[PDB]
Design a protein around this ligand. Structure first.
Ligand SMILES: OC[C@H]1O[C@@](CO)(O[C@H]2O[C@H](CO)[C@@H](O)[C@H](O)[C@H]2O)[C@@H](O)[C@@H]1O
Ligand SMILES: OC[C@H]1O[C@@](CO)(O[C@H]2O[C@H](CO)[C@@H](O)[C@H](O)[C@H]2O)[C@@H](O)[C@@H]1O
Ligand SMILES: OC[C@H]1O[C@@](CO)(O[C@H]2O[C@H](CO)[C@@H](O)[C@H](O)[C@H]2O)[C@@H](O)[C@@H]1O
Lengths: 447, 447, 434
């Protein structure tokens, strides 16, 4: 392209041994580098989509290859190894002098040592997206790629103590990589887990032990989908039911299985839901239901076919009804509402980067526009995509594409936002491209 | 024995096909049965110790056998199975009419569907204790028992995403079986996990795939111990260090790895610790340190040899210094301090059974006296055991052996306490028996 | 001449081959005028007087520097909070200082130090020099600037002294009024009775009596006085009224009522329209004793307060800078959510080793030798092991300061001065008045 955004993305590209292998997190000139000079696996996904749609796919291929290689490297902290299948949160290229080499952060350098659980899932989704964009079936089939997928599946499908098909994680294990009360069974992890499973179903070779893998995958998918749809789904009708639940019920055949106390349901959600609206809850576990709306989880649930067609309609209906809360002056609010006061103190451990309506704690994130556009297109609500894109276009180039926006409605540029945040740039590009050729959404959606 | 307590325990015994296989949770006449007419695996352990020391060991043997059989039964909820190794929280004997049969609760009937993670660990510890009390090596070696242990190990040793040797659980996965902010990496789970591993090391046959199991076990133990001792351990010196930590540090070689913000350290702990005192923290995870003192975790850490000899001394030094907080009018407070106010609301989801200084939320639990006596004996602090026992003896028979006591110092009989709680009865019995023959502590301790 | 002596020697700054001051800290990782004071005292008692002389000379030169912020020229008398050697001298006058705080206490410490130098060396010549006499007059011009109000105290913005961050110590904080009083008394001796010098002396006499009266009568807090204020009627209008500053008793905090011992007493932290700050500030109260601003009875009462509330005010590390700490919402509102001054940390109720020298001096003057002994003992038990932290935190000072610099010079000099004061009490006359 000849646009400003195309050129900005082009300079983000990281080269290794004369080859493009990824993109930097940001091209901010004045902020301390911290880990933003690295290539984050989750960040790379919207950049990858841009390159796949342009038709220059070697950077995507090289990324997938190098990341797979990174997985093979021994990862350790104090004589203990995680599962071999773990993908790192990010990597950078280090020049010792002379020859180049790749250094990864698997969680052993990460702040608070958060595990990048979503990384390995995005890896699979990007592998699928590569395949569907290019038609190249050879990459995924190759021995090392097959083995790589299986290692990821081993970690995902690992046996639980719990009675539930969902996946258990520590706090800060996905896009929200800091302590945000998204421990246990956060929506985003479950939705990505579900999507990656469907992808693996397309990607795996039957020959070898794959048959057993595929049967595991098919089994988990059904259970996962049933559980998510029946227990996470929130609308007025279901809320009315939960609110009338009786506490401390014991036995197999009971209504309140997770022992939710109605007195704990927050006041804001009853007023917030429209009659024809609804969404997937943020979390579910013993005695706990997180009613916070999480944007990525809900939008990807539409794209992955996890939410039903009607349920997808009701999520979009919610976006329309509460446009100022979830889009406001910058698509898209990452979650709603913000944690405030003592709740912010207890749940985040007084994390100053996640003060109310900032960053993960109810900030607005430009990148999420690409998921929103795709979901809007999938649900036949093109007009919402136009409006969201229009709003983002009106401020991003002028604000130099900040990492995130703050405030109840995203009025403020993020407190500590990097400028020239690559996936803020890629996010808008992808959204416009989807809008131009809706079919491309099939790279990331499932029938 | 000819004592009142001996007879009370005797009537708790559950018979199945003319054989003793366990004990009821309570013999309370007026409370709704709920799940207290069942045999809880964790509850049975102190009863089992009484019977092992008396020398009537068939009930213990039958319990171990039947529980192992229960493990084999298909456990499911909505087309999803947990790992085969899962032990149930409790079982009861049901008379359809004519023939008897055993029905278990694996979490699918449990309130809030909490998983009984500690159950499978106690199963192994009781198996070891049986063996050491009786000298019978045949039970554990038998094919079905070996397989049973390995299934449990498969679940415990299952591969993580995290960089840590600790074990990840949902909230309410141990003795505290309700939502209490003990999700992620609660001390008790880690200590029991560590103890069960050492037991498995004694129990496993080398022949077969056992060699690989034993090497896994030996590997995990070292990592687990190092991690617990270095990161969970709290005293003035370490607290001074943590408080001076700088937030948001990135990289491998940093002091504040889990990104604890000093401003979040609670005010109470600085005043609470004596100079020569210390303890293992309640939890550790991304951006999170739980400074609450958990009694079972800390005492079992002494018995399991997890805490160092000095560290064990410093824990007991803490008990002595804060005797009124942790023992008060009834040994032993389950954890300190209580969650109060909005913290109680947010963390427990307004759980009315766990109001401040009640039940799990800072209540006093008679059963924990047996662990305290054993730890006191192991640390050469017999006098503390005498005093704790004296206090419990002064009220338990008169109060009809309540399940728990409430209040800052356990003045009140628990709000919803069952009377004739079996492990309240067994707990005192075990403590007196340990006191009479200190060597018996070797049934539950490790060198 | 222990390790502490070596660290202080190593702290010394040189400029063109001459010792001119000491660094704030030798933390493995400049000169603050207030920080230099306890160092100076050690040098004077050890006979190394030239470093103190040079400091007074060099800082005097800094005063005359033309400075401005945004096209505005302030009063000439201003002294910087700190300076650094770069060779040439460069000064921070609050121009580059965080929050643009004005170092009001700097110039008063300058005056008190000039006096101490003279008392220590018996050299009367330095202060008599025209440049020194001019320096003093410039400081007085600013201090004695005419006011709109009937208060003879000195008006300042927040964070204008040792506590140099926003801490609710704006308006008429004790420390400033006490240092103001002491500096005026020092100037009373130091000024030349020249034609010009006479007019300055007139203004000094004209403000000194009024200031002492105001502080003693309206800042003094004890049970008896507290009982009066608690019974004040609100919204009194007139010249002859009891509740002049219109204190509303329902706002008197519950802690002070139970805090005061029967024989205890202290100077309040602040006074102004509708405002009494009941917080205890250690430096203001201890210097009031030394400067002779508090009466003998009042000095004894303050020491009684220390003895009675030893855990609050001394605890693990002498001495708590102020009590009690702003907490919760109050901390939010009054400090503007200042992360360096969280409850029981730093300015907001931390414990500061340097204050030990003031406490020792005050205890010696009041005859409470035992309290000096115990205070010093507590400090000696920790400081070396902890590497002389800048400050300590917590209700009782158990924790080493959150962001404390190690090898903080006035923590080191503070202990030395205290020990040497204890060894020879006559030396307290450097910072005290007959
Ligand atoms: O160690 C995790 C650490 O990384 C951060 C930023 O340093 O993560 C943010 O930035 C990444 C790069 O764009 C994003 O991938 C991520 O989603 C975002 O949260 C911190 O938040 C976190 O402490
Ligand atoms: O479904 C779990 C449910 O069981 C309870 C009591 O019904 O657990 C308590 O009682 C058990 C029997 O003594 C103990 O093993 C357990 O430690 C104790 O918490 C409830 O607390 C819980 O909701
Ligand atoms: O570290 C120096 C830095 O700290 C500040 C902020 O409070 O001042 C503190 O340190 C000074 C030097 O020791 C003290 O004189 C002062 O009392 C203390 O508050 C800044 O002013 C300074 O740049």
């Amino acid at each position: 392209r000849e646009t400003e955004s195309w050129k900005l993305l082009e300079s983000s590209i990281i080269y290794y041994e004369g080859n493009p292998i990824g993109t930097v997190a940001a091209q901010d000139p004045e902020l301390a580098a911290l880990n933003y000079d690295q290539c984050f696996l989750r960040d790379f996904v919207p950049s990858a989509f841009v390159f796949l749609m342009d038709g220059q796919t070697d950077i995507v291929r090289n990324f997938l290859i190098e990341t797979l290689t990174l997985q093979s490297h021994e990862k350790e902290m104090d004589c203990f190894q995680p599962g071999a299948g773990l993908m790192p949160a990010s990597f950078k290229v280090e020049s010792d002098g002379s020859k180049e080499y790749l250094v990864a952060d698997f969680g052993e350098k990460a702040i608070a040592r958060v595990p990048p659980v979503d990384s390995c899932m995005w890896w699979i989704l990007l592998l699928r997206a590569y395949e569907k964009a290019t038609g190249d079936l050879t990459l995924a089939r190759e021995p090392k790629f097959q083995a790589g997928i299986k290692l990821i599946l081993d970690l995902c499908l690992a046996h639980r103590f719990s009675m539930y098909p969902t996946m258990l994680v520590p706090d800060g294990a996905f896009m929200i990589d800091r302590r945000m009360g998204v421990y246990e069974h956060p929506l985003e992890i479950q939705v990505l887990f579900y999507a990656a499973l469907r992808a693996a179903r397309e990607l795996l070779l039957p020959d070898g032990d794959g048959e057993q893998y595929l049967n595991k995958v098919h089994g988990r998918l059904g259970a996962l989908q049933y559980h998510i749809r029946n227990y996470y789904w929130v609308d007025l009708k279901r809320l009315r039911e939960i609110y009338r639940y009786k506490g401390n019920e014991f036995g197999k055949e009971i209504a309140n299985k997770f022992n939710i106390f109605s007195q704990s349901i927050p006041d804001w959600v009853i007023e917030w839901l429209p009659e024809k609206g609804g969404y997937l809850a943020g979390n579910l576990g013993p005695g706990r239901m997180d009613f916070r709306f999480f944007a990525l989880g809900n939008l990807m649930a539409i794209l992955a076919g996890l939410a039903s067609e009607e349920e997808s309609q009701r999520i979009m209906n919610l976006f329309a009804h509460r446009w100022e809360d979830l889009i406001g002056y910058m698509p898209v609010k990452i979650c709603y509402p913000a944690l405030q006061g003592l709740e912010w103190q207890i749940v985040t451990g007084c994390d100053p980067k996640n003060i109310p309506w900032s960053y993960h704690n109810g900030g607005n994130w430009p990148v999420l526009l690409w998921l929103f556009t795709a979901a809007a297109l999938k649900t036949g609500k093109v007009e919402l995509a136009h409006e969201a894109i229009a709003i983002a276009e009106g401020r991003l180039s002028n604000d130099k594409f900040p990492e995130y926006y703050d405030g109840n409605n995203g009025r403020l540029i993020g407190k500590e936002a990097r400028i020239y945040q690559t996936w803020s740039i890629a996010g808008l590009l992808v959204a416009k491209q989807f809008l131009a050729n809706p079919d491309h959404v099939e790279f990331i959606s499932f029938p």
